[PDB]
Design a protein around this ligand. Structure first.
Ligand SMILES: Nc1ncnc2c1ncn2[C@H]1C[C@H](O)[C@@H](COP(=O)(O)OP(=O)(O)OP(=O)(O)O)O1
Ligand SMILES: [Mg+2]
Ligand SMILES: [Mg+2]
Ligand SMILES: [Mn+2]
Ligand SMILES: [Mn+2]
Ligand SMILES: [Mn+2]
Ligand SMILES: [Mn+2]
Length: 756
DNA sequence: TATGCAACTGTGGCCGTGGTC
DNA sequence: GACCACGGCCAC
């Protein structure tokens, strides 16, 4: 299989490198013949003689057109002949593309900003990660000597651990008497030993957890201090640390550096993304955490270094196990998109949409539209109407069915052929007309995007059918993550239409999808209520909760299935309402905030404070206990006792101050805020000390006893001292606990006074 | 800023916070 | 006290 591609330059000429693993052997294929190019549409074919003469310069070098070729293509499905302009080196294209666009005989130019090594995959029809080849994988981790107030990596790496199918080991330069610990003389020999291990094992994949942003950079600084050629690359190169906007990423040439952290952070919703928390969530088994401050004391004192080495060994071990489970999911994405796992595992959904479209366009002989210029961008800043959200019938409900459209917006796109190559296209026999916004879509031929979505949705549904019939709970969870990844990808084709930077931008298509969605969901609601005597309790965009008031569970379930048969026969094309579940009880607080309990006692909560990372633990804990008392038991009196226990304890300062921390992310430079909330107030004070606040910095603060603005008396929790600071019990009662639970316990007649 | 030097699919909604009047 | 923009996070 193909692992990756890049290109280097030799004597001015590009050379594509294809990193392969075939029949158990690593290979680099060199392609010295593939040429960069872009396309020009000319006012007349005679003008090619001038265009071929155009020259530019780049750093001393004269840039010329190498050769040209007339080709017949389509643009949004309409046939057109263009000239394919070939050049000697990819960097010729930026240097000359504008001088060609500006030539008076050139109408427009296309496909002039495509990364060369990825262009190569598309045009050659090559897909990374195909085949039955078994890849060799190795995970690693490091333990470091940390002291507060030091520059990054000023202290040495203490241990390097690594794990694979054969087991896990730790390399260190202090004597530790564990069987899996290899002792060497110095930090330098440790690093060199690890380098030797990687070269001997020769893994196809190197697995880290946040190695993109810590492990490799730490190793780099140390290797700069120590004079080490850290030649992990299969071509003898060192890890390449690249900046991609606000964070970094690391390549090891000839291998795939698989950093789990961006994958997990995108797939699993967790309050914290420690390795321990991620391991427990996936496997159900605990992992002890040894903190940076314990690591340093153990090393300086020499006492209890076994515990550090075990912790280091386990980091590698679980990093490996996690990588074993998540690499196959990302490898499927890599094949679906047609790009390397390194890139696919680190990209936003929209970037994957566009790489997929660019490949499908190439296969269909469709020119890509260009990205917008600054003027076109500014023209694309208007919004448009989205999904319909019904105000809920607040309160407790019983015997509730949840019905929900399968992949609604993609299904609309498929059914109504919604696409920029079919919008208001004149001369067709057949059109579908979007409600409210009126855009007309030709139905006589499949639009480009509509014709691609069907295979995605069909693949998702297969994964789902397998997932629901899977006994192993871990394999089922991984199948869930996989079918969810395709759901988000397919919906991102819709969002792409309304995405200002998209090539296949189509705001008319975007708002037609949403308009059809609004029409379908409201039609389904009117139908189930009028023809089946259901009451719709709550509805959001394409699904709703309903019951038959007075009816038992058996009856509600029977009639719901009858409705589905009826309504799915009326719906067109790919549109399908699905039975998503039954809930014996449910509590609806507001739009987007509710909780339901299934017939097995499992509670699911949406939007409520329990699921919010920026509410205090004590508030979330209390609300969770309340909802369990209400929905699982029938004990409203117990729910209130819980609340009073909490307000009493908080008053008596019996609640552990750790449950009172508020976490809120900084999203911009501190100068760009217009209002200063508590987390910005704390962040500005930390900046004044020189701490360095960035977008993505999380402020974890606690509110101290006082009366004025909350940000005036808010401190970071790492500065809290119970011997000096009293937390603001009245604030956590009146501003965290009571608000979250009172919104539920109103429905039973409980005022705030009845709970404190 | 990646031989990918700008910045990461879309809209709807709650609600504490700190302003205004 | 009534009201309102902001901001962060969340549900689709
Ligand atoms: N991440 C998203 N990006 C864009 N649009 C979205 C996103 N999530 C939801 N929507 C839109 C498109 C969805 O089709 C629609 C309804 O959401 P939802 O029911 O969650 O998903 P779905 O109908 O695509 O999948 P499912 O088959 O799991 O119901 O709202
Ligand atoms: Mg690459
Ligand atoms: Mg839905
Ligand atoms: Mn659904
Ligand atoms: Mn749906
Ligand atoms: Mn807040
Ligand atoms: Mn806002």
């Amino acid at each position: 299989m193909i692992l990756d591609t890049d290109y280097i330059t030799e004597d001015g000429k590009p050379v594509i490198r294809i990193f392969k693993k075939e029949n158990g052997e690593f290979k680099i294929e060199y392609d010295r013949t593939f040429e960069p190019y872009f396309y020009a549409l000319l006012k007349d074919d005679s003008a090619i003689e001038e265009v071929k003469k155009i020259t530019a310069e780049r750093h001393g070098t004269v840039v010329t057109v190498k050769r040209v070729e007339k080709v017949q293509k389509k643009f949004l499905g309409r046939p057109v002949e263009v000239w394919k302009l070939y050049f000697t080196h990819p960097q010729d294209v930026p240097a000359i593309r504008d001088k060609i666009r500006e030539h008076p005989a050139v109408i427009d130019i296309y496909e002039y900003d495509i990364p060369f090594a990825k262009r190569y995959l598309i045009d050659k029809g090559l897909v990374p990660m195909e085949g039955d080849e078994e890849l060799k994988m190795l995970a690693f981790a490091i333990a470091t000597l940390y002291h507060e107030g030091e520059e990054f990596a000023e202290g040495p790496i203490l241990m390097i651990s690594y794990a694979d199918e054969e087991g896990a080991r730790v390399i260190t330069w202090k004597n530790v008497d564990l069987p899996y610990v290899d002792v060497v003389s110095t930090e330098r020999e440790m690093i060199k030993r690890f380098l030797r291990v990687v070269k001997e094992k020769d893994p196809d994949v190197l697995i880290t957890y946040n190695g993109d942003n810590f492990d490799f950079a730490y190793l780099k600084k140390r290797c700069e201090k120590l004079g080490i050629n850290f030649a992990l690359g299969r071509d003898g190169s060192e890890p390449k640390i690249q900046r991609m906007g606000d964070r970094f990423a690391v390549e090891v040439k000839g291998r795939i550096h698989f950093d789990l952290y961006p994958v997990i952070r995108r797939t699993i919703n967790l309050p914290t993304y420690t390795l321990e928390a991620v391991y427990e969530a996936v496997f159900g088994q605990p992992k002890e955490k040894v903190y940076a401050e314990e690591i340093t004391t153990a090393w300086e004192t020499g006492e209890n270094l076994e515990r550090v080495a075990r912790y280091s060994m386990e980091d590698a071990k679980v990093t490996y196990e996690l990588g074993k489970e998540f690499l196959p999911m990302e490898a499927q994405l890599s094949r679906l998109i047609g790009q390397s796992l390194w890139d696919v595992s680190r990209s936003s959904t929209g970037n994957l949409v566009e790489w997929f479209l660019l490949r499908k366009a190439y296969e269909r002989n469709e020119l890509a539209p260009n990205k917008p210029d600054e003027k076109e961008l500014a023209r694309r800043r208007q919004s448009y109407e989205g999904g319909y959200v019904k105000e809920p019938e607040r309160g407790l409900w019983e015997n509730i069915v949840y019905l929900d459209f399968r992949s609604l917006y993609p299904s609309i796109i498929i059914t109504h052929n919604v696409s920029p190559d079919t919008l208001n296209r004149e001369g067709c026999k057949e059109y579908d007309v979007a409600p409210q916004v009126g855009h007309r879509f030709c139905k006589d031929f499949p639009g480009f995007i509509p014709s691609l979505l069907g295979d995605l949705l069909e693949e998702r549904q297969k994964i789902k059918k397998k997932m629901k019939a899977t006994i192993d709970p871990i394999e089922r969870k991984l199948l869930d993550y996989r079918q969810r990844a395709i759901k988000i990808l397919a919906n991102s084709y819709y969002g792409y239409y309304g995405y200002a930077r998209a090539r296949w931008y189509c705001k008319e298509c975007a708002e037609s999808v949403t308009a059809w969605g609004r029409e379908y969901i409201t039609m389904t609601i009117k139908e189930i209520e009028e023809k089946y005597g259901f009451k719709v309790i709550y509805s959001d965009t394409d699904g709703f909760f309903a019951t038959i008031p007075g009816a038992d569970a058996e009856t509600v379930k029977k009639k719901a299935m009858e409705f589905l048969k009826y309504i799915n026969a009326k719906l067109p094309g790919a549109l399908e309402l699905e039975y998503e579940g039954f809930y014996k009880r449910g509590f609806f607080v507001t739009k987007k905030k509710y909780a339901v309990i299934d017939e097995e006692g499992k509670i699911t909560t949406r939007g409520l404070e329990i699921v919010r990372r920026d509410w205090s633990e004590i508030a979330k804990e209390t609300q969770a206990r309340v909802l369990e008392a209400l929905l699982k038991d029938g004990d409203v009196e117990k729910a209130v006792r819980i609340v009073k226990e909490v307000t009493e304890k908080l008053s008596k300062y019996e609640v552990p101050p750790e449950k009172l921390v508020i976490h809120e992310q900084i999203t911009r430079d501190l100068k760009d805020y217009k209002a200063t909330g508590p987390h910005v107030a704390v962040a500005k004070r930390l900046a004044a000390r020189g701490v360095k606040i960035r977008p993505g910095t999380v402020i974890s603060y606690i509110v101290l006893k006082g009366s004025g603005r909350i940000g005036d008396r808010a401190i970071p929790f790492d500065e809290f001292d119970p011997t000096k600071h009293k937390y603001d019990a009245e604030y956590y009662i009146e501003n965290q606990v009571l608000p979250a639970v009172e919104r539920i316990l109103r429905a039973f007649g409980y005022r705030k006074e009845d709970l404190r």
